[PDB]
Structure formats: C-alpha cells, structure tokens
Point group: C3
Amino acid sequence: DISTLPRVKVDLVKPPFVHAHDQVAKTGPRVVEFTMTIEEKKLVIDREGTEIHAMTFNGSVPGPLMVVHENDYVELRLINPDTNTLLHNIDFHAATGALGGGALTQVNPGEETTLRFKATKPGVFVYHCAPEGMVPWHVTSGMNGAIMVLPRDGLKDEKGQPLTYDKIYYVGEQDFYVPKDEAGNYKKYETPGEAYEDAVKAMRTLTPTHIVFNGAVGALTGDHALTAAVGERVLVVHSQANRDTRPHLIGGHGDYVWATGKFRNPPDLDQETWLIPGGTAGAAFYTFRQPGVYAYVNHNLIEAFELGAAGHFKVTGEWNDDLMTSVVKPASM
Amino acid sequence: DISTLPRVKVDLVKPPFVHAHDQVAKTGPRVVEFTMTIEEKKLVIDREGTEIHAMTFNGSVPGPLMVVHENDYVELRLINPDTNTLLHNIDFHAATGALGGGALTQVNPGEETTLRFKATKPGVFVYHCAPEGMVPWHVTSGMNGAIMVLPRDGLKDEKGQPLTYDKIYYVGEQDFYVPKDEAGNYKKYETPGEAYEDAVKAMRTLTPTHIVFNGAVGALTGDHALTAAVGERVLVVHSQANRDTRPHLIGGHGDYVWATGKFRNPPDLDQETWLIPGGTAGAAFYTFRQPGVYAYVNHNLIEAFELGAAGHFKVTGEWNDDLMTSVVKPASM
Amino acid sequence: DISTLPRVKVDLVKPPFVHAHDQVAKTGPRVVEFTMTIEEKKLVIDREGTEIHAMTFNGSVPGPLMVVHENDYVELRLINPDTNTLLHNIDFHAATGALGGGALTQVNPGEETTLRFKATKPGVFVYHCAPEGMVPWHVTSGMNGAIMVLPRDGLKDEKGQPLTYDKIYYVGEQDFYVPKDEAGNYKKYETPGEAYEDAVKAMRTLTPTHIVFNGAVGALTGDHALTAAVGERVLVVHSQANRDTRPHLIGGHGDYVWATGKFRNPPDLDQETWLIPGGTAGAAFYTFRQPGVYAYVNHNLIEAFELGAAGHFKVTGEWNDDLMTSVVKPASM
Ligand SMILES: O=N[O-]
Ligand SMILES: O=N[O-]
Ligand SMILES: O=N[O-]
Ligand SMILES: [Cu+2]
Ligand SMILES: [Cu+2]
Ligand SMILES: [Cu+2]
Ligand SMILES: [Cu+2]
Ligand SMILES: [Cu+2]
Ligand SMILES: [Cu+2]
C-alpha cells in the first residue's frame, strides 16, 4: 500500500516563514518527507545579553512549521549529531501512538532515526522533545515547534464556505526560566548539563523570567516586523508548548479563530482576544483594513511589555476615515 | 455621509450601573457622543487602609460601560485636565486601526481630543489606556473599562430566538500589584510618579496582591450588593483587561454565556464556571429562580476569598422546594 | 408529587472508579439516595513522605463521583462524625439555590443533615465544601468531588448521533499549598487547626507546592494505571475545583470533548489539549487505536513532571503500523 504512494521531499524554512504548500490538495495522499537536525546552542535572549543553552530542532526557537494534508503520511528523519551532549526525541501531538512517537525516536549524540505516522486529524498541533525524566527541561529550553494538517479541501468559515489566505506566519511563543543569583542577576553556564540542577529549581517557581516570540525579546520587531497590505487575508499560527497564552492583534481582530486549532470545528468569530492552552497550537485568520503598525501581543500586558511577548505587523495601504478618524487632534483645552 | 446622520449625546453612569439604551434598535445608524474625563486619584482598596494612586476614566475603577449598536459611530471627547500629572490615551478593542485609537489620542495634562470610529462588530469589548512604554502600569492602576456593541436586533439564543434582559450590571475585575517592604507591609507614595520604579518590580512577580470587583475589597457587598427578583432575566458583563478570570454565580448558573463576548457566535449553555481570557470582556445571561444571597466570584477561591474577587446578589421572592429543600435540618447524630 | 416517586439507594465507589449506572435512562425520574461521611485525615502526598491533614468526603481525595439523570432528585445524607474537629458543609454546582446547598448543610462534628435538590441541567459539575470564611482552606485540603447529570437519552456527538462509552474513569486534580520553613522544607502539624495560620499565608503566594491526580504523586501509575483495550470507547471526567488545568492524553486525542462539561452544548472535536477552568468539571471521550502506555497529564509540563500532575493508561491490543511505524530504528550515523 505505502510502497505505491508518491513521495515528495520538503525543505523547511525558518520561523516566522513557512515552506511552500498548497491549501487545497491537488494530488491524492502522499508520503511527505522531512529532515530535522538537532542543535544545542547558546542563544542571547534579551537586550542586556542574557544567554542560555537552547535545545533546538533545526537551529531555531521555535522549530520550523511542517505543512501536510489530512491522510498524508509524514516521514521524519531526525538526526542528533555527535556535537550535541544530550539524548533527544520527538513527540507529535498530531500522531497516534507511542507517546506521539517519543518512545520510537530516542537518539543519543551521533544517532539518527526515521519515524512515519499517518496524519489522521486536521488542525495545527504542537510537536516537542520529550525525553523520559527531563521533559519540562527540554521543552522550556526551546525544543518545540508545530505541524499544520490541512483538510484536503482547505479552510472553511462558520458556514462551510472557503477561506483562502494570501500570507501565513508562524509565531512560536516561548516561556524561559533563567536561574538567578541572590540579587536577581541571571546566571550563565559552560554546558547545558551545568545548568540542569538550577534549571529545575527555577521552573518550580512557575514564574517565567522571559516570555518571547521567535526566540528573543524584540525578534519580531523593527526590521523584523511581519508585513502585509490592506486587503490581504493573513493566517497567523501561534503555539505554546507549556503555558497558556491569550494572543491579541492591537488595532485588529481575529475574524475567524480556531483557539484550540482543530479544523473540524467551526471557527469563533470576531475575537478581540482568544485563549490558547499550554500544549496547544491555534490559528487566527484576519483581513487587514487599515495601514500602519499593529502590535501582536500576549494580552497579559506584563507578560507582553515587561517580559518580551510582543511583535509587530507593518501594513501598507490607504487609510479609511469611515472606520476611524481623529475629529479633533490633541490640543490644549 | 456622516454629516447627514442623527446624533445623540449620552451621559455615562458609574459601574456597576449602565446608562439607559434600547436593546433592539428603533432608529437607524447614528453618531453616539460620549465625553470622558481622566482622573488620577488616591484610592483605598482594602479594609486595612491600603492606598494606591489610581488612574481612571471618569473617576471610577473600572471606567463606565458605553452601549451602542452595530454600525453606529462612536464619537469620544477625551479630556486630560491640567491637574493630572501623566500623559494618557485610549485604545478600544472594538475599533479598527491606529492601535485601537491609542496612536490618535495621546493627551498630556491640559489637553483634549475627539476620536470617532465605526462599531463594525457586535459584542462586549475592553477599552484601556495604552501609552507607549507605560502600558501595563496604567492598565493595572485601574485604567480600563468596556464598550458593548449590541446587534441591531438585540440578543438571540442558541436557536436564533430573542433574549431580552430586564436588568444589566457591569462588573469590572481589577488585578493590583501593591509594592511591599521586606516584612510584607504595603508601601504608600506621594505621587503616581514616585511609585513607578517599585510598581514595575511588583508587576514582574506576576502575583497580584489584590484582585477586586468595582475597585475595592467588598465593593459589591452589603448595602452594595447587586439586586434582582425571582423571575428576572439578568445580563452580567464582566471584563479583565490584563489577567484571566473564571466567573461563577454560587447557587446559580450562566444559562447563556458568551465567554469571549462576541455576539455573532452562539452562546454556551448551562455553564457552572466560564474562562474570560485577560484582555477580553464576556457576558452571561441568567434567570433567577430562587431568592436569597448569591455570591458572584472569580472561581480560583484563593483569588476570591483571600484576595478580594467576591461580590453579592440579593434576590427577592418565594422559595421553591421542588428545586431544593432541607429534608432533615442539621442535627445531632 | 415526590411522595409518589420511586427511590433507589446507591453505594458509592472510590475514584478513579465510578458506581454502576445506566447511560440511557430505562426508568422515569427518581429520587436517587446517597450517603457521604466526612473524614479529616493525615495523608502522605509525595515520595519523600510529605504529610498533610486532608479534609475528605468519604475518605478519598477527590470525593466520589455521583451519577444521576436529568430531572432526577438527588437526596444526600451528609454525616460529620464527632471524631472530626471542624464544621463542614457541601455546595453542589449542579444545584439551584442556597449557595448550591451550602447554607442548608452546615454540620459541626457530631451532626448530620439530608438535602434534596432537583438536577435540572445535564453535565458534569463540581461539588465542594464551602464553610463561611474558610472556603479556600477546605477546598485546597482536598474537600471537593464531582456529580455527573446524564441526559435521559445519554451522550450524543456533534450531529446528534449516540455516543456510548465502554469504560468511565474519574480523575480529580488537586492543587496543594504545603507551608515551608526558611530553607524550603515542608512543615508538619498535629491537628488541622494548628496548620491554619500558615495554610493561609502559603495559599496567598498562589503557587501550589504539589498538583496531583487522585490525591498523591504517582497515584495513577504503575500497578494503578488506568486500563483499556484497543477499540474501547473511554469517557474520562476531570475536575479542578480551584485552579485551571489543561488535560492531554500523550499519544492520543480527545475525539469529543466538553471542556466546560455541559452536555446541551455540542462537543469540540479532535482536541490535542483542552482548558478546564478552576471551579469546573469537563469530560473527554476517546477510542483507543494503539496499545501501549499513554501518559495522561496537565500540559503545563512543569506542573505535570515536577509537581505531580501525571497518570498512566496501559492499553492492550495489536499495534497498527499504518498509523505509526519506526522506519529506521535509532542507530549510529
Ligand atoms: O490592545 N493594547 O493591549
Ligand atoms: O460555589 N462556591 O465557590
Ligand atoms: O505529549 N508530551 O507532553
Ligand atoms: Cu531534547
Ligand atoms: Cu505534549
Ligand atoms: Cu493612562
Ligand atoms: Cu488591549
Ligand atoms: Cu470542609
Ligand atoms: Cu464553587
């Protein structure tokens, strides 16, 4: 049966960008092949130079977004090079059995493996490393990403009518727990292993020291802001592998939102803010109607503005005064 | 086009009360005019006299509830008197563009401005102050409220049938982060500015010192309890601009609930408790069936009973033994 | 009217098991009689011997699951033996009036009472002790459980078609706040009363020291894992009386999920993880398709793996390679 299926190899792209794919499937079920390389690396997460030993899928935090269609087979080649120091694996929330694949993918530095699973349910799902006994430690070190399983006929609105996006972005939100000295200064370590004992005590406080988009404070800002034009339909996938978040587009809305990200359910309309539970990926669809800068944030504003959970959208186009206008500009009175 | 529209000025009322309005629109689209005055003031929040420098819209925490209909134009005159010390603005989650209006409404002490926006989506939304760089500080100092955009044909149930409330109340929930000394005593400051540096360090712990309804511990109790009679249909709007809450009416239910508050979606039925994400306003509709006192609470009971997130309903009427009865009153055995 | 109704006494079973009942009602409305005995007892909650003074309904944490049908009358005899030291009561979220029954059920050591209420709404609900002034203290000491009110025609899917489970399990999740000394060691007390003053200060930090299933770290593991076979339809009821949780079955899904647990609403499909708000009971229905061990967890992985919110499912049957297979087992390369 599988022997007879067509196969296509797909090369992944770095978040927030997403690899080329078709929304509506033009071919029948296939075996979609991906290759990921694990990379343990030092990463600077804020403006003051705080450094951590990130554990990554393909060198990025979050790991890249994989896109397939319902009933396709995902075939993953996972490589853990001998330059790493720890055992890693991968658990797909999109998959059925063997702890999401985690029990079949344990690779020590110098090993590789290939797992295949059938994508039987449509929706956006989280995938993350989950080694027996060090689970929260690898996840909160940035070792998580997401896979999107599209219905073969693409997205549909509350009424069964087609929804087609023009642009798609992947925002992976990460909660970090950096150990601190008595005064509150962040600690630095030589290897991932040296940090372990302190990492555990920092996580048990349940209070993140940083909560960021795309791996660092300000990663999605300035020259890195997400871009769009008035009139474009944008799909924004957002994942949080460990902790709850409440995304919100300032100056905009979630016209159609699957907060818990499963496409067999109808979307919620006109959301101001939506809750994505820790361990879940969600998707929001919006059509831009006004140009300018928009801030995309986790709506606990302390987590957004003090901790790092803020990004930008820079949108081009003509201003519409019907929707909004300054009748009297700020003046003395 | 707007030139030709009828206009009506509306005078706001203090929470938990709501200004007079029609559920079902009897007129066509209009320009609804509101005036809000910013007031920075000291506020005592608990029984022991803890004081803070509240930043308010119209002198209350939360700011008043505005009520309009879908496709009406909201025209707001915002005044920041010279007696204030800080720059303020306003971002409406109900609006499209310019950061919810925040980028068009920056007023220093002594200034005013008038913003107009079209209410294109029906639902209850949060509005809050959002000055560049001091966002969480103004919000958690009480500078937030809500606007309700009613469908022109009013509320409907899961089946499209009309829902008409007899009473409506606005409960604004506020998380406060009061700085503390080494022993745990709350600090006091001369001006809002003196508190700033400590405010920031208190917010980063992410642990509120108080979580209250209508600005203070016990504000909605005793002589201030919300009132109703058996048989009345009550709509309770609840907002949390920064943090998640889970409202619950003890001894009652949410017969129809829009947890994320957007009226184009059908309501959830028979809720015991519902989650309102930080940065969102929700609405619950209930018909009283038994008389007595009811406690309306945030269902994390520590936040409710230790931190201040508890209010009361005092309901008049006849007891129904079919629904409930004490078969054997507490006695020795 | 009630005089004329048939009556049936039901003997409760210890969680995670559930007493015998019919899914589809074969009789007309009845008066279902239950007896619960309060028991204050010392309980060891972790591997290192941490002990607490648990306050329980029937000797277990959580209290047992009660199962009735919509429009049946629940008649509860509640006994607080003279061996206890504190006043207790019971508030049913399933009931209408008198604070869920809390104001009608106050019993001091040596007393008993019998409350009757009509189960007018279908769904899974929480019940918990709620004495005026010590509410969070009795709840977080383990004094809560759940009642399931089944529609008279049983469960239905998103389309109105019947859903029949083969097995049902009750998982009660508990957040504990154990007082600590200066170094971080947990304190021990002689009586519940001696712990009170410190209990309050520990709860106000809002940071649980333990979060467990069925009363202890590892209670649902090893020889205590939940069991099933490939092909069985399992209903898992989960409750959290005080704090939010996000259940997730590793290697599986929630095929039909009522996150806020009210059966008049259609279920959400294909959930990876779902949010159950503090003060609520939810239910997830799943059909096992692969054999092996599954971990059932609260998906904030720090709360799961460091704090105790993890249990197991041991499923028998044949492996299906179509759904998943190890193409290349971990090897050197
Ligand atoms: O929409 N300003 O958080
Ligand atoms: O319903 N007592 O939290
Ligand atoms: O599905 N491993 O949390
Ligand atoms: Cu890893
Ligand atoms: Cu997981
Ligand atoms: Cu302000
Ligand atoms: Cu906002
Ligand atoms: Cu009790
Ligand atoms: Cu309760």
